[PDB]
Design a protein around this ligand. Sequence first.
Ligand code: SF4
Lengths: 289, 286
Amino acid sequence: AMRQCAIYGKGGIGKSTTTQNLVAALAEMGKKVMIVGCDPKADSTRLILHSKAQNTIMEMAAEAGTVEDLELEDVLKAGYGGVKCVESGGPEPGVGCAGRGVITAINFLEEEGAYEDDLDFVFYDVLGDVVCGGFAMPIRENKAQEIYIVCSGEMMAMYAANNISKGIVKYANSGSVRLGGLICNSRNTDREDELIIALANKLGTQMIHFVPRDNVVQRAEIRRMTVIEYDPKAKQADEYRALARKVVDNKLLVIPNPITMDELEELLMEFGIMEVEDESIVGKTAEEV
Amino acid sequence: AMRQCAIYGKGGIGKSTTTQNLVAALAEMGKKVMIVGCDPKADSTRLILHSKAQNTIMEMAAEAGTVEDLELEDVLKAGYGGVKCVESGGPEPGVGCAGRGVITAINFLEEEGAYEDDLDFVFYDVLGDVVCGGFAMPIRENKAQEIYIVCSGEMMAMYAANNISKGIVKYANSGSVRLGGLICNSRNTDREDELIIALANKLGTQMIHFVPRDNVVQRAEIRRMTVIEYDPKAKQADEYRALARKVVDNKLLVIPNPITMDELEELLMEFGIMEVEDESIVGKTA
Ligand code: SF4
């Protein structure tokens, strides 16, 4: 039926551009999609709308002052490929939980049954810098069944992926939340792909795709658009089509096996990212040794 | 008497390293300091203690049933310069507020009288990727009055400073929590110091110090130590000493003026970070 997915990832590594280019490729495939951005900043839909920034629910839930009031023309703007783009926004720093913007928006959308109105895929675009009750909501309430984690060969990105996995673990029984795989957004780090493949193996999942750096992304980004609509004949455009088809045809939805800090640091060390500590010189000043 | 401070800032920009290096310089300087780490990850004290990972109040609380049994000598360890250290810890990922461990830590350190046993400064090392719940707690409950924000010449690091600054405004009349300045953790970017001086001035504050990048930092860190303890003669040791002195003499404690995204983007464009929006080029790439 309609598939509900979520792309989780640490911020600062192009996750949203990947989510958006991913959904664009899906749209070109003739798939009906909707993006629910769950990022406070709200950049999960600009590339699809060619906008500077989309209006969030929170912002215009402070205009009419009451949670439910905004047919979808002011709140749910459809853009490229028929992809419906929505933004949750977040509350003011210090005003209740920041996941209030998320928890709000779904109910509101389930109230307009936007989920039932001709849809094949829904992708919540969520940040994983903090995996707390607020941001794990889509998972917790069983709102997102297929999770895909965007990460890079870096400590925090991999730490964030492990924590998202822990949160998937926690709810794998109460509902049907499952990890579809890891998406590595290359940051031009050596053995990055092999590091993520390794992490995929350890977590007991798969690195469903390696997204390369290709300046046509930054190029199309400036255009406030995806690499797909920009130049569908770009070599990078094919990487999204590939990822997209693996997502569509993904049978592998697992319950992850998180690793310990040692295992992670272990991984990071054998791939040349983290320095191996020399036990002897620990706590010795530069003059002593 | 004791000054309760907190270093706020987004993750991944070298904040905990800057905090421990500043605290070591303070201790080298003769000051009696306590660091209360508040990052669920718990990495705010290892350089002071030359440790693998300090056991967090949360990990322990989960052991002897609850936080009532916990002993203070098991929670608070002292290291270089006599600096005392504690790690709040945090709940398991996805279960409740990620930053709640602070409430548990503060309440315990309170009952145990930790704050009256010879302390000149307390520094909560708090994350600021989001400013809500347990993260905003030291501000909300008036637990730290002097806030210093670590940031760099990057969009997200700047955005977090602004939201943290927003959090301070919100609790203005709530207590005496004020912003004491921005600390720039250089990322070896062009005109980075200028960029932060620009934002601090826009905020109604000061860039209290620009921390340069320097390999001596990693050389000290690989040994689980601060630059002050590892190489006191280093140029970088003086930088942390300068910061320490200015923080100690700081008198500028204000209620910040949160800028807008457009202003943010203005500083970034203006300083060689973001590019000016071309326009014929938008909407219909080719
Ligand atoms: S649960 Fe998360 S979103 Fe909510 S207040 Fe806590 S840290 Fe913030």
